[PDB]
Amino acid sequence: KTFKQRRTFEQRVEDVRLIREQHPTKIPVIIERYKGEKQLPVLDKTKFLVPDHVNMSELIKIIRRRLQLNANQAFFLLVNGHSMVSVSTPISEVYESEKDEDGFLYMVYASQETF
Template sequence: MRSEFKNRKTFEDRARDSAAIRDQHTNKVPVIVERSSSEKSLPILDKTKFLVPDHVTVTELIRVLRRRLNLAPGQAFFLLSDRGLPPGTQTLAELWESEHDEDGFLYVFYAAQEYFG
């Protein structure tokens, strides 16, 4: 999946931003959350850059994002990384460690349907 955030900012700017964030907030993870390019039914978040405490799990992040998007309880919502669907019990620190981009940000995408590829 291609990130709009990457299209808007140069690699150098992104790397500098993430390094500054990690230096100032050692117990937080810089995360970019974007709507999947193929997603049409879910609304777009009001912001894409999040600073998430490293102990927060993927499930907790999903709960926060669902609340920000004002989704109905039964509405489907999936959070995807480049490798697919991360385990809900995985912390953001663990996910960042295994899947962060070379610019230092963790990129995740949300969609109403689970898909891979």
Template sequence: LNMLEMFTRVQPSTLSSGSVPTFKERRPFHARKNDVAEIRRQQPNKVPLIIERFDGERSLPLMDRCKFLVPDHITIAELMHIIRRRLQLHPEQTFFLLVNEKAIATNSMTLSQLYQSEQDADGFLYLVYTSQPAFG
């Protein structure tokens, strides 16, 4: 698969248990690490993101895909606006983005800054969206 195909594949449908396997569960570490190396080589000004719905979340919809390449200068606030549009949320619906099981401190932070401090060992930046402000 070329990189464009990899980043446009649709997320698998919900399993009978009701949960969707995470990207890490579906793709082995070495493959993810190789994917990021190729992406960063081809597009060094983009951040490879994995955005998934919190496992226990029921009020927010699943996104049509979980893998995104986003310009590194985009702020968290801009990313949240993009996600809100993709989820087709009503104006009164709220959601929170979490990174490494904690809320993102500031909406003015760029993805580049967040990526530098929070990227996974495989090179992706993993974000989780939820209707609740924290796990628990």
């Protein structure tokens, strides 16, 4: 069902190594809906190549646009399992501290802060 379940650790590692070789300026991000989540839609895909200069505040703007949300729909984003301390951090810096051992940056969204 989830990305980690669909691909072996070996497979996730090799895919990140390909993104490094073919899209060296991009951050490999997994973005998944919370398994509880009722309100917000599912995305058209799971694996995203994010430009390494965008900060977390702009990535939230991007995901809201991709989900085609309106002004009063609530949106919460967990990174590597927990809340973001800051949305002003460049994703290149967030990646280096919050990346998984497979080399993806894992994110989960919901309409409640209570995930």
